[PDB]
RNA sequence: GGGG
DNA sequence: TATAATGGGAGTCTGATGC
DNA sequence: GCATCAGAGCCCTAAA
């Protein structure tokens, strides 16, 4: 949801020694998949410090307890001899799609709000095929395919979905 | 922009357009309930977009 | 502009509706000192005439006019917004 | 990914340098890089040679030189300066009465320089000079509309370089000459030339009734001198016909190679048409004391033989592109230079007849103000000098190649008719038949064709390959239209085996007329289909399938495409998208072979073989004229091995060197719940999520602090009656801090101005006295964010007076400029378009779960309504989608050239290979055909789409080859009852965005005289309720609504003031009073000495001024 | 000069 | 406030109606 | 007949 890069006042900046502009850097931080092991933890802040001729990937974030980076191979910035990178990324748990203009999250004065795709679900398909109990025909065999980023697992997703749908049917209880 | 969901007698009107077009009406109403103490203060509040509650 | 015309009318209307709620008369001594649509600002000399008192006294009810106005103003703080 | 290129046409030559019409024209005009003795007499040089020597003392021209620019280009744009070079001229003064020689190099001012890409910087803003089409000088013969059997010979010179001449043959039988709208018998002018009755009889006579009709006895009764005096009285009623005075007038109008200039192109056309050879560019000469004819008799000779019917005499088509020529940047600028030079010459002669005829040098004799003014006038205020279109690189590339028939020396809208706007047969290969404006300007503004070049004379030439026997050589000949009409030219796609024409019958043109011809008759052949169309049109794949009217819109709209941060090249290209980026100069390339030393956001350093370390700085987030961001990004990595001409950085709207005007999205062609209605477009929220169609825009704000008679304006952080919350983002000096979000109402630059004698009113004095606070000396004039604008502050420029290098316009102490940036996500009301002319505004953004999706879960990006296709007849977009479907699964992009492209069988082959990937994956993953896929197939087999009696895989494949797929409604889960066209389309986000256009006003600024609201969003204007709007209200009988429009909502001052007061008090609006503009009308009629009286029923005057205007 |  | 000085420079097509 | 005159669609944007 937010990024603070050292010696950077806003998104349209550019870093000496870094190939990518800040717009692209944040575009790369939007692909970061960050799993919270502790269910009670609603927000963290990742730290990165890099220099020299290195290609910073997501692994290089300084490790924090109860937080696992599911895609440590993701490219972040290409640094060149003398290029220095220091940042603080605020990662949150949330639902749906909340655009940067909406949340405006800034940990400090120079923080850049980032577009948040909270939803862990990358793709959902379902097959419906013909089946029989050998007595009856035109029965349905339902197969739900669920792809996720790994922060939550296809099974956990399916249970939350079912739990949401069940919880929704309760609302039909009290008439007027 | 097309508005299929509209009834024949309706149109979609952007809220920000409506605030300017009806601005005098809005000031009186902002006093009647109370969003501002009086008409002059209400106008001062619409001037800055972040002061709009 | 329409806004400006409205404002001037509203300022004059609260200004008189403010000098009479203390008293019309100590508001009358003060009203003579500035002038609504007159611009009757001089100083100590001319003030020799018709207020109702002699001459140093009005320089006091002017303070008492302004002071009584000042307390009553914090309640009817509606004139604050005309400060732009 | 793979790039599969189609087409069998081998193009023998590449496209010419695309900006050469600009670059070559101006280089030729200035000749700055030529050593003076080697300059040819053209451009600036020719102008000097024409103006000098200046006679009485003789001032003679030696040579000129151009200095280096005082400031580089970047600096000029920053400081609002013209990018220009100092011009000097070495002049020698000679005294004809003495022998005296004084020589000096005088400074004539600056001349604007063209940048490398063909544009100009004039007062800090980038400009383009548009080429102008017009009638070539020469001698023309057109049929006389009045007499169906007679003809007019017209001698037309270069614009402003002479009169138009008409030689009509009158009903009386005598040949008449028309000059400056006056007519007389031509015989008189013939006698002045020294002609005798014998010469005209002996030369012509062959035409029985015509040659004798020119002979008039009274005219012959006088020597050549008497005829010259006689003619002058026929032209200047009131000027005494003094023999030296008459000679002067006639010489300057006809024989003077200074006041009368046929073109150099005029000279060639005249020599060629009449079969004579001209000694110069004038119609006659003054030689050995009398006048000697050059043009007039040959023109008369041609006219009579044509009137008769002599072989070799034809009428001229005035719209033929051999008779219509282009005036390029160099020529246009040089004309204004010649004008400015002539004005300076007036100053020289006037100064040589005053203040001591001796004590003068050339430096005091010359005032350069007339020259500087003519040049500054051309670049700033000419109609051909336009603000650059630099929305995207193609915008400016297209702008430079545009051709206008309007401007100073051309048509008007109020004055141009069908013949000029038409597409002439000779436009083939020269002027694009597609790219023209819709509306009043149709056909007047056009675009240079891709392979066309303007020759030295100004005629547009197009390339053709020679065909000898049946063998096609590789030698290419650039032809004018006149020269092209001689041969039989085969089409570019005519079949070839090797270099041989392989068909027994070829499709060819003779004088534009299509004709079927045997290979023995083939003289030349087209180089390519690209040569018929403009650069924008050549960017449209499958153009052969698009109706021209929509292709036009396709062309023009690419000009309007906004550079996107994720911009991509189309998956179906035409093969021109590489050249456009390269010639545009937005992209950065490697000079020689080398190794990449350094790669930064700000710069790229390359170590070449030469050993030199070259540093290429990158333009980063610079604001173009239209506020789209020009920004270059590094495409190479440290240590990468590069060859000569390899890509280093991507410009805006370019991806790896290919033109990127938009994005490639997955589109479904189908109605969707009326959100698709009448060209509206439905898009997926997934597009915003992944930042498709997001673009950066920068707005510039400026404020001046000036000296006033009331005291100085000051830019300060101290602003009366404002809280610290309001000032929070302002620095010590009163300027907003770089990197702040500013929203409407926020202060950008604080400024105070001294209060007028409006020195606070006694009402305000007493109020101020109550709060212990004295009314301040200064008022708050601060610059604020306008309604609807705002963003992040990315830059500030402050320029004071008294800082090194800066001096402002008189009275202005300091200027502050604030650059504010915004990232614009696509939103409802933004406009999208493809290259085929499909355009629509985004009416709905659905969440991804509502979007139609493939069985395997992939949701579509865009839903386009099929109702836009059939009336519009642009099917190329359909073929684009099909080939785009294949590429989505095959992972490929294609190059399908126009008119030599991917055809249906070839697309079907690709589509079959795709189905295997779209389906075979599924069968292997352990899933069979879906129940709903069976239901759609049932309905599809009822439609004749699939063959009845085949397996579901076979039938789905039959549908996939038609580009249709099974589509699931994300709302229901049920299928769409029929197979739907789905594929990848290239769609651009155009420059028309609701954020820019939404506007509203309650009350605001009023006009001085009319007291009616000002116009336009930038002035906070009101809408115009015009004559036709009033008619509508009248037809509704809405009398009170209309009256409100005419009074309370406009210029009824008492009414508008009173109505506002009522609304804020909750009362109903009062009855209106007299509109102030009616009072203006009354007073304006009185100024015309007319008494206008408003009367009552008793006919007594009613005073609408309420006593104010009566004594 | 662009938009409808 | 005084040699004498003496005549200017420059550039579409419609239909309706009064000489 | 021929010249002289006054007509020649609307709203909007940005540049000056």
UniProtKB/Swiss-Prot annotation, chain A:
Q: Name one GO cellular component term.
A: cytoplasm
Identify the stretch(es) annotated as Alpha N-terminal domain (alpha-NTD): 1-176
Recorded catalytic reaction(s): these are: RNA(n) + a ribonucleoside 5'-triphosphate = RNA(n+1) + diphosphate
Q: Which domain of life is it from?
A: Bacteria
Query: Which terms does the UniProt entry file under GO BP?
Result: DNA-templated transcription
Keyword annotations for this protein? DNA-directed RNA polymerase, Nucleotidyltransferase, Transcription, Transferase
Enzyme Commission number(s) from the entry: 2.7.7.6
- Which GO molecular function terms does the record list? DNA binding; DNA-directed RNA polymerase activity; protein dimerization activity
Please explain the role this protein plays, according to its UniProt record: DNA-dependent RNA polymerase catalyzes the transcription of DNA into RNA using the four ribonucleoside triphosphates as substrates.
Domain notes from UniProt: The N-terminal domain is essential for RNAP assembly and basal transcription, whereas the C-terminal domain is involved in interaction with transcriptional regulators and with upstream promoter elements.
Q: Which family does it belong to?
A: Belongs to the RNA polymerase alpha chain family.
Q: How does it assemble?
A: Homodimer. The RNAP catalytic core consists of 2 alpha, 1 beta, 1 beta' and 1 omega subunit. When a sigma factor is associated with the core the holoenzyme is formed, which can initiate transcription.
What is the protein's given name? Answer: DNA-directed RNA polymerase subunit alpha
Q: Which organism is it from?
A: Thermus thermophilus
Swiss-Prot record, chain B:
Top-rank taxon: Bacteria
Transmembrane feature ranges:
none
Member of which family? Belongs to the RNA polymerase beta' chain family.
Function text: DNA-dependent RNA polymerase catalyzes the transcription of DNA into RNA using the four ribonucleoside triphosphates as substrates.
Binding partners and assembly: The RNAP catalytic core consists of 2 alpha, 1 beta, 1 beta' and 1 omega subunit. When a sigma factor is associated with the core the holoenzyme is formed, which can initiate transcription.
Q: What is this protein called?
A: DNA-directed RNA polymerase subunit beta'
**Native source species:** Thermus thermophilus (strain ATCC 27634 / DSM 579 / HB8)
Q: Which gene encodes it?
A: rpoC
Curated annotation (Swiss-Prot), chain C:
**Region of interest (Sigma-70 factor domain-4), ranges:** 18-70
Assembly notes:
Interacts transiently with the RNA polymerase catalytic core formed by RpoA, RpoB, RpoC and RpoZ (2 alpha, 1 beta, 1 beta' and 1 omega subunit) to form the RNA polymerase holoenzyme that can initiate transcription.
Top-level taxon of origin: Bacteria
Role description? Sigma factors are initiation factors that promote the attachment of RNA polymerase to specific initiation sites and are then released. This sigma factor is the primary sigma factor during exponential growth.
- Specify the DNA-binding region ranges: 44-63
What does the record say about domains? Contains 4 domains, connected by flexible linkers. In the active conformation, the domains are in an extended conformation, each making extensive interactions with the RNA polymerase catalytic core.
Where is the protein localized? Cytoplasm
Q: Which organism is it from?
A: Thermus thermophilus (strain ATCC BAA-163 / DSM 7039 / HB27)
Name-wise, this protein is RNA polymerase sigma factor SigA
Regarding protein family, the annotation reads:
Belongs to the sigma-70 factor family. RpoD/SigA subfamily.
Curated annotation (Swiss-Prot), chain D:
Question: Which gene holds the coding sequence for this protein?
Answer: rpoB
PANTHER family xref list: DNA-DIRECTED RNA POLYMERASE I SUBUNIT 2
Which GO terms fall under molecular function for this chain's record? Answer: DNA binding; DNA-directed RNA polymerase activity; ribonucleoside binding
Q: Which GO terms describe its biological process?
A: DNA-templated transcription
Query: Which CDD domains does the UniProt entry name for this protein?
Result: RNA_pol_B_RPB2
Broad EC category: transferase
Taken from the UniProt record, the cysteine pairs bridged by disulfide bonds within this chain are none
Residues annotated as signal peptide: none
Name any one Pfam family assigned in the record.
Answer: RNA_pol_Rpb2_1
Quaternary arrangement and interactors, per the entry? The RNAP catalytic core consists of 2 alpha, 1 beta, 1 beta' and 1 omega subunit. When a sigma factor is associated with the core the holoenzyme is formed, which can initiate transcription.
Native species: Thermus thermophilus (strain ATCC 27634 / DSM 579 / HB8)
Transport: is it a keyword of this entry?
no
* Matches recorded under HAMAP family: RNApol_bact_RpoB
Q: In its UniProt entry, what is this protein called?
A: DNA-directed RNA polymerase subunit beta
Q: Name one GO cellular component term.
A: DNA-directed RNA polymerase complex
Under which EC number(s) is this enzyme classified?
2.7.7.6
